[PDB]
Each structure stands twice: as structure tokens, then as C-alpha cells.
């Protein structure tokens, strides 16, 4: 129910991060801190993403 869209590629630094490509659509799964959220990609992969790299999607 909450999706965002990537504004920039993100490649992670840690294994726990979720890489993505500019324009990718992600589902938010948890918001443990303000700037880093847990998300799921179209493939079902999960990991942390940086909030400033995304925008609300639809």
C-alpha cells in the first residue's frame, strides 16, 4: 500500500541495503528511522533504502 519511485540509482554499501535503479518502484515495508526504510523491489527482494533517493509513487 505505500510505494515510492527511485529518483537516482542506489547501489548500497552494506549487504543489508537494497540496491535499485533510477525509476524503479519499491514497496515500503518498515520505517525504523527517518532516512532509511526497509523496502521490497519488484523481484521480492528486501533491504534498506535511503529516503532522499525516492519520491512517493501514485
Amino acid at each position: 500500500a505505500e510505494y515510492v519511485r527511485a529518483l537516482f540509482d542506489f547501489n548500497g554499501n552494506d549487504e543489508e541495503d537494497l540496491p535499485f535503479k533510477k525509476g524503479d518502484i519499491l514497496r515500503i515495508r518498515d520505517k525504523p528511522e527517518e532516512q532509511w526504510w526497509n523496502a521490497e523491489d519488484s523481484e521480492g527482494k528486501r533491504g534498506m533504502i535511503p529516503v532522499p533517493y525516492v519520491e512517493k509513487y501514485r
Partner: peptide, 15 residues
């Protein structure tokens, strides 16, 4: 003439 990737925000916690 595009903007660069933003500075990655620091993580408050470990995941």
C-alpha cells in the same frame, strides 16, 4: 547537465 546523486544520509542505526 544533470544533478548528482545525493549525499547518502547517515544511518542512525545498524540493520
Amino acid at each position: 547537465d544533470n544533478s548528482p546523486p545525493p549525499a547518502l544520509p547517515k544511518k542512525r542505526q545498524s540493520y
